[PDB]
Design an enzyme around this catalytic site. Structure first.
Site, mmCIF file in Angstrom:
data_model
loop_
_atom_site.group_PDB
_atom_site.id
_atom_site.type_symbol
_atom_site.label_atom_id
_atom_site.label_comp_id
_atom_site.label_asym_id
_atom_site.label_seq_id
_atom_site.Cartn_x
_atom_site.Cartn_y
_atom_site.Cartn_z
ATOM 1 N N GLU A 50 0.829 -1.213 0.000
ATOM 2 C CA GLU A 50 0.000 0.000 0.000
ATOM 3 C C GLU A 50 0.870 1.273 0.000
ATOM 4 O O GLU A 50 0.683 2.138 -0.851
ATOM 5 C CB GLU A 50 -0.946 -0.027 1.205
ATOM 6 C CG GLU A 50 -1.404 1.318 1.744
ATOM 7 C CD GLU A 50 -2.191 1.157 3.038
ATOM 8 O OE1 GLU A 50 -3.352 0.678 2.984
ATOM 9 O OE2 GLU A 50 -1.648 1.501 4.106
ATOM 10 N N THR A 102 -3.128 -27.396 -1.675
ATOM 11 C CA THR A 102 -3.984 -28.295 -0.933
ATOM 12 C C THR A 102 -4.782 -27.484 0.084
ATOM 13 O O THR A 102 -4.291 -26.489 0.657
ATOM 14 C CB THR A 102 -3.232 -29.545 -0.353
ATOM 15 O OG1 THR A 102 -3.364 -29.631 1.068
ATOM 16 C CG2 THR A 102 -1.758 -29.572 -0.781
ATOM 17 N N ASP A 207 -0.012 -30.234 9.585
ATOM 18 C CA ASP A 207 0.403 -31.271 8.629
ATOM 19 C C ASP A 207 1.040 -32.463 9.380
ATOM 20 O O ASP A 207 1.165 -32.432 10.615
ATOM 21 C CB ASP A 207 1.404 -30.677 7.625
ATOM 22 C CG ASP A 207 1.446 -31.432 6.304
ATOM 23 O OD1 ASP A 207 0.955 -32.573 6.248
ATOM 24 O OD2 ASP A 207 1.985 -30.890 5.311
ATOM 25 N N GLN A 213 10.448 -23.681 3.644
ATOM 26 C CA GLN A 213 9.625 -23.140 2.569
ATOM 27 C C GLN A 213 9.505 -21.635 2.656
ATOM 28 O O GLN A 213 9.659 -21.046 3.735
ATOM 29 C CB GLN A 213 8.223 -23.739 2.640
ATOM 30 C CG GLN A 213 7.609 -23.611 4.016
ATOM 31 C CD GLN A 213 6.189 -24.086 4.065
ATOM 32 O OE1 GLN A 213 5.272 -23.375 3.656
ATOM 33 N NE2 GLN A 213 5.992 -25.287 4.579
ATOM 34 N N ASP A 221 -5.386 -4.654 -3.760
ATOM 35 C CA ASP A 221 -5.714 -3.244 -3.813
ATOM 36 C C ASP A 221 -4.490 -2.363 -4.056
ATOM 37 O O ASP A 221 -4.589 -1.379 -4.794
ATOM 38 C CB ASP A 221 -6.529 -2.788 -2.587
ATOM 39 C CG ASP A 221 -5.751 -2.872 -1.268
ATOM 40 O OD1 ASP A 221 -4.853 -3.745 -1.119
ATOM 41 O OD2 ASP A 221 -6.071 -2.059 -0.363
ATOM 42 N N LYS A 267 -10.148 -19.051 -3.881
ATOM 43 C CA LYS A 267 -8.935 -19.437 -3.164
ATOM 44 C C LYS A 267 -8.340 -20.743 -3.679
ATOM 45 O O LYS A 267 -7.159 -20.797 -4.042
ATOM 46 C CB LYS A 267 -9.225 -19.552 -1.667
ATOM 47 C CG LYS A 267 -7.996 -19.678 -0.766
ATOM 48 C CD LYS A 267 -8.468 -19.925 0.657
ATOM 49 C CE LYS A 267 -7.315 -20.070 1.632
ATOM 50 N NZ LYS A 267 -7.932 -20.346 2.950
ATOM 51 N N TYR A 268 -9.180 -21.773 -3.720
ATOM 52 C CA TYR A 268 -8.774 -23.099 -4.176
ATOM 53 C C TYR A 268 -9.341 -23.452 -5.560
ATOM 54 O O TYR A 268 -9.530 -24.649 -5.899
ATOM 55 C CB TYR A 268 -9.150 -24.133 -3.116
ATOM 56 C CG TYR A 268 -8.345 -23.943 -1.840
ATOM 57 C CD1 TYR A 268 -6.964 -24.140 -1.841
ATOM 58 C CD2 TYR A 268 -8.953 -23.544 -0.649
ATOM 59 C CE1 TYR A 268 -6.204 -23.953 -0.693
ATOM 60 C CE2 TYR A 268 -8.206 -23.361 0.512
ATOM 61 C CZ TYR A 268 -6.834 -23.563 0.485
ATOM 62 O OH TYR A 268 -6.063 -23.398 1.615
ATOM 63 N N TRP A 294 -9.221 -10.491 -1.562
ATOM 64 C CA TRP A 294 -8.440 -10.034 -0.415
ATOM 65 C C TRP A 294 -6.973 -10.315 -0.563
ATOM 66 O O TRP A 294 -6.136 -9.568 -0.047
ATOM 67 C CB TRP A 294 -8.969 -10.650 0.872
ATOM 68 C CG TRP A 294 -8.582 -9.855 2.098
ATOM 69 C CD1 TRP A 294 -7.560 -10.142 3.016
ATOM 70 C CD2 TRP A 294 -9.186 -8.594 2.575
ATOM 71 N NE1 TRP A 294 -7.512 -9.194 4.012
ATOM 72 C CE2 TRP A 294 -8.464 -8.234 3.810
ATOM 73 C CE3 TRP A 294 -10.214 -7.765 2.124
ATOM 74 C CZ2 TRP A 294 -8.783 -7.097 4.550
ATOM 75 C CZ3 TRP A 294 -10.542 -6.629 2.889
ATOM 76 C CH2 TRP A 294 -9.827 -6.290 4.061
ATOM 77 N N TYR A 389 -23.568 -13.508 -8.681
ATOM 78 C CA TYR A 389 -22.964 -14.596 -9.466
ATOM 79 C C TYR A 389 -22.572 -15.775 -8.559
ATOM 80 O O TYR A 389 -21.450 -16.292 -8.617
ATOM 81 C CB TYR A 389 -21.752 -14.086 -10.271
ATOM 82 C CG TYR A 389 -22.109 -13.111 -11.384
ATOM 83 C CD1 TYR A 389 -22.246 -11.741 -11.115
ATOM 84 C CD2 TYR A 389 -22.271 -13.548 -12.707
ATOM 85 C CE1 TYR A 389 -22.562 -10.845 -12.124
ATOM 86 C CE2 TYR A 389 -22.580 -12.656 -13.727
ATOM 87 C CZ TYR A 389 -22.730 -11.302 -13.422
ATOM 88 O OH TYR A 389 -23.032 -10.389 -14.405
ATOM 89 N N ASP A 488 -9.920 12.046 10.232
ATOM 90 C CA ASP A 488 -8.899 11.273 9.556
ATOM 91 C C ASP A 488 -8.527 12.037 8.294
ATOM 92 O O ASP A 488 -9.320 12.121 7.362
ATOM 93 C CB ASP A 488 -9.418 9.885 9.194
ATOM 94 C CG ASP A 488 -8.328 8.991 8.648
ATOM 95 O OD1 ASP A 488 -7.525 9.459 7.815
ATOM 96 O OD2 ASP A 488 -8.285 7.814 9.059
HETATM 97 O O1 LIG Z 1 -6.877 -1.352 7.306
HETATM 98 C C1 LIG Z 1 -7.115 -0.182 6.563
HETATM 99 C C2 LIG Z 1 -6.078 0.916 6.800
HETATM 100 O O2 LIG Z 1 -6.200 1.457 8.096
HETATM 101 C C3 LIG Z 1 -5.345 2.548 8.339
HETATM 102 O O3 LIG Z 1 -5.478 2.916 9.682
HETATM 103 C C4 LIG Z 1 -6.741 3.410 10.076
HETATM 104 C C5 LIG Z 1 -7.255 2.698 11.305
HETATM 105 O O4 LIG Z 1 -7.711 1.431 10.920
HETATM 106 C C6 LIG Z 1 -8.419 3.458 11.912
HETATM 107 O O5 LIG Z 1 -8.926 2.808 13.047
HETATM 108 C C7 LIG Z 1 -7.945 4.822 12.289
HETATM 109 O O6 LIG Z 1 -9.045 5.560 12.736
HETATM 110 C C8 LIG Z 1 -8.729 6.717 13.501
HETATM 111 C C9 LIG Z 1 -9.067 8.028 12.776
HETATM 112 O O7 LIG Z 1 -8.068 8.385 11.855
HETATM 113 C C10 LIG Z 1 -9.146 9.198 13.749
HETATM 114 O O8 LIG Z 1 -9.625 10.378 13.125
HETATM 115 C C11 LIG Z 1 -10.026 8.910 14.940
HETATM 116 O O9 LIG Z 1 -9.868 9.987 15.868
HETATM 117 O O10 LIG Z 1 -9.602 7.726 15.573
HETATM 118 C C12 LIG Z 1 -9.502 6.564 14.792
HETATM 119 C C13 LIG Z 1 -8.827 5.570 15.685
HETATM 120 O O11 LIG Z 1 -9.808 5.091 16.557
HETATM 121 O O12 LIG Z 1 -7.479 5.508 11.179
HETATM 122 C C14 LIG Z 1 -6.587 4.909 10.282
HETATM 123 C C15 LIG Z 1 -6.985 5.516 8.973
HETATM 124 O O13 LIG Z 1 -5.852 6.100 8.491
HETATM 125 C C16 LIG Z 1 -3.873 2.235 8.059
HETATM 126 O O14 LIG Z 1 -3.123 3.430 8.149
HETATM 127 C C17 LIG Z 1 -3.642 1.514 6.729
HETATM 128 O O15 LIG Z 1 -2.352 0.994 6.598
HETATM 129 C C18 LIG Z 1 -4.672 0.406 6.533
HETATM 130 O O16 LIG Z 1 -4.656 -0.025 5.214
#
Ligand SMILES: OC[C@H]1O[C@@H](O[C@H]2[C@H](O)[C@@H](O)[C@H](O[C@H]3[C@H](O)[C@@H](O)[C@H](O)O[C@@H]3CO)O[C@@H]2CO)[C@H](O)[C@@H](O)[C@@H]1O
Length: 627
Positions: A50, A102, A207, A213, A221, A267-268, A294, A389, A488
């Site tokens: 990411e 498997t 197993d 391995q 994404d 997946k499989y 995912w 689907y 955020d």
């Molecule tokens: O998994 C998805 C992505 O998540 C990113 O982190 C997020 C956290 O999962 C999320 O809980 C947190 O939420 C904050 C928010 O930013 C804030 O404004 C609020 O006050 O509190 C929350 C925490 O309780 O935010 C971040 C979103 O950036 C990862 O950074 C990322 O790698 C990941 O893909």
């Protein structure tokens, strides 16, 4: 260069200022400047595919504003050098397309692992393998492994050498209830140097015996984001008369897209809708859901006795990327070299757009997704389950506590891509999808009178869509609710970015939605006004969940004993911090402890690399579209 392009440059400068510490000594970006952070990675100087994808994106935009494509090239160069496993990291031998892996079940709680291999369960055929090998002449899978220990904090090194930086590691392995707090970080390359007698393998898969391995896990994404970024670099470079500098790099995005098709399969490789683990395997594309699932994953014995590939049966709308799919399907510069690559991406484009529409709530927010493997065990769907689907609707694909679609962030990240796609093509379905979603966004975003703002943080869901039959029904019994609000900044900027592309689209194709443009501009300005700081922008966040540092038990089977590289003992009863004792040397550790012992929520102002990127990109986007 206008005000907004200048905004990009300033943040770009912060990001690239060596003293700010966004990158390690090799130029690999970290998850965040600050080390004490736990959310998807569990430590801030790990990194993700990411982050790498956002790095490619930031530099693509730099090339647009700048005419300088050196940053984009070195971004890609770093990505390929470190985040894609090399020939030595993934020496795949003896792959069987008729028996790609498997089977093992997924289980509701971590304490049900290791999951037993089930050697009688039929597995389907991989129809990609031969075509890819024929095309590239190589067995190397060209995708990013999702998780990296950049400065060897955990201590696994590369290929079990205990020393090297840019170390491949993994965490999540134990089903939908193994939170970020409940993992055991382990090397992607397993030589039994650490953990128990069988390294970490028998925490996860049961197993009869165990072999040294390697295995890697792609986050579809991120790979698609990188492709998406490269598409824009391609058109921008072309505009400047600079396509040729970049050509071998659009070729990287093309090839990454070719391998990313693994994300489009069960997946499989079981038939869509099969609802029976004992059912025969698919024979080719009857096991393709044509969405970005995912993960995909691939592994091999060190002795070369075998290897395996899996897709994923679980699909989240938050992963989809119609811009990248469109580009790979339709743009002659981006088309993969394989015979069926572009064709497969055209199918995925259409299937993705249908998926978004199917998931759209009565209000307009997008619901979680679907699975082809009910409880990850190919079980029978409950009576009345809505399907797409042959896949069953799931409000929260993959993770249930807390649910993976309770995060507002996916709304922005994912709809931003649809917004781009609509801007480019005028696709009527995308337009209609976006119009309803924008309507919902406008109704839930808070622009306060005092100049502040709040965006949805947590969401809750009820009901399900109507079963899909090619047309949007309005889904009047599928409902979203905004649980609470936050600031955020990464997601705010992403949301602004999506609103701007949508707005530019409606001007180009319909009735100009000025209100959307203005909502975005406000978000970007009020943020710029309020949150700038020494290293970029940050907003305060309380992290009461950090009590889990001290309180969260990590499941370990009775009698299983192992060790982390630093000497931490792994056994029943251990806490999150007990297997990560180096956290105690963190600059912010006293602060965490003081907060915890005083029963208070510690507070942080983080600089997440992707967030700073989204902020930079969103401001530049306003300049690019409305400049
Ligand atoms: O998994 C998805 C992505 O998540 C990113 O982190 C997020 C956290 O999962 C999320 O809980 C947190 O939420 C904050 C928010 O930013 C804030 O404004 C609020 O006050 O509190 C929350 C925490 O309780 O935010 C971040 C979103 O950036 C990862 O950074 C990322 O790698 C990941 O893909």
């Amino acid at each position: 260069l206008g005000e907004y392009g200048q905004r990009f440059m300033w943040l770009w400068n912060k990001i690239h200022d060596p003293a700010n510490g966004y990158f390690n000594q090799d130029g690999i970006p970290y998850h965040s400047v600050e080390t004490l952070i736990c959310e998807a990675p569990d430590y801030g100087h790990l990194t993700t595919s990411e982050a790498f994808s956002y790095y490619v994106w930031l530099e693509a935009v730099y090339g647009k504003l700048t005419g300088d494509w050196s940053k984009f090239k070195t971004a890609w160069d770093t990505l390929e050098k470190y985040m894609i496993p090399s020939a030595e990291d993934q020496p795949m031998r003896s792959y069987d397309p008729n028996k790609p892996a498997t089977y093992a079940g997924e289980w509701e709680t971590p304490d049900k692992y290791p999951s037993p291999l089930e050697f009688n369960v039929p597995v389907g055929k991989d129809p990609l393998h031969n075509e890819l090998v024929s095309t590239y002449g190589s067995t190397l899978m060209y995708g990013m492994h999702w998780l990296m220990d950049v400065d060897n904090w955990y201590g696994y090194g590369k290929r079990g050498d205990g020393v090297s930086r840019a170390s491949f590691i993994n965490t999540f392995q134990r089903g939908p209830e193994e939170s970020v707090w409940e993992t055991v970080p382990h090397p992607s390359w397993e030589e039994f140097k650490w953990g128990g007698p069988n390294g970490f393998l028998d925490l996860f898969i049961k197993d009869q015996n165990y072999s040294k391995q390697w295995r890697y896990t792609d986050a579809p994404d991120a790979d698609a984001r990188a492709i998406q970024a490269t598409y824009w670099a391609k058109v921008w470079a072309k505009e400047q008369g600079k396509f040729n500098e970049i050509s071998s790099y659009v070729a990287k995005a093309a090839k990454m897209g070719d391998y990313l098709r693994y994300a489009m399969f069960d997946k499989y490789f079981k038939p869509l809708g099969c609802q029976d683990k004992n059912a025969a395997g698919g024979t080719g594309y009857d096991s393709a859901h044509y969405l970005l699932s995912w993960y995909y994953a691939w592994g091999g014995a060190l002795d070369g006795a075998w290897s395996w590939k899996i897709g994923s049966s679980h699909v989240h709308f938050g992963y989809q990327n119609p811009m990248a799919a469109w580009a790979l399907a339709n743009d002659s510069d981006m088309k993969p070299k394989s015979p069926n690559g572009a064709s497969d991406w055209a199918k995925s484009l259409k299937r993705q757009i249908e998926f978004y529409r199917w998931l759209q709530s009565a209000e307009g927010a997008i619901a979680g997704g679907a699975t082809n493997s009910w409880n990850g065990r190919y079980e029978k769907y409950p009576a009345g389950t809505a399907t797409f689907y042959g896949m069953a609707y799931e409000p929260n694909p993959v993770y249930h506590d807390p649910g993976s679609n309770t995060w507002f962030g996916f709304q922005a990240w994912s709809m931003q891509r649809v917004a781009e796609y609509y801007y480019v093509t005028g696709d009527k379905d995308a337009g209609a999808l976006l119009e309803k979603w924008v309507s919902w966004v406008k109704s839930v975003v808070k622009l306060n009178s005092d100049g502040t703002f709040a965006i949805p943080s947590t969401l809750d869901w009820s009901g399900q869509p109507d079963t899909w039959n090619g047309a949007y029904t309005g889904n009047s019994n599928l409902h979203v609710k905004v649980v609470d609000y936050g600031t955020d900044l990464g997601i705010t900027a992403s949301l602004a970015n999506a609103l701007l592309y949508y707005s530019a689209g409606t001007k180009k194709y319909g009735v100009f939605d000025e209100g959307a443009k203005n909502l975005a501009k406000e978000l970007l300005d009020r943020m710029w006004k309020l949150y700038r700081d020494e290293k970029g922008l940050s907003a305060p966040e309380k992290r009461a969940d950090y009590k889990r540092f001290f309180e969260q038990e990590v499941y370990i089977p009775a009698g299983w004993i192992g060790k982390m590289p630093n000497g931490d003992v792994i056994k029943s009863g251990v806490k999150f911090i007990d297997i990560r004792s180096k956290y105690k040397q963190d600059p912010d550790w006293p602060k965490l402890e003081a907060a915890y012992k005083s029963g208070q929520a510690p507070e942080f102002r983080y600089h997440r690399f992707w967030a700073q990127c989204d902020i930079a990109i969103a401001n530049a986007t306003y300049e690019i579209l409305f400049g």
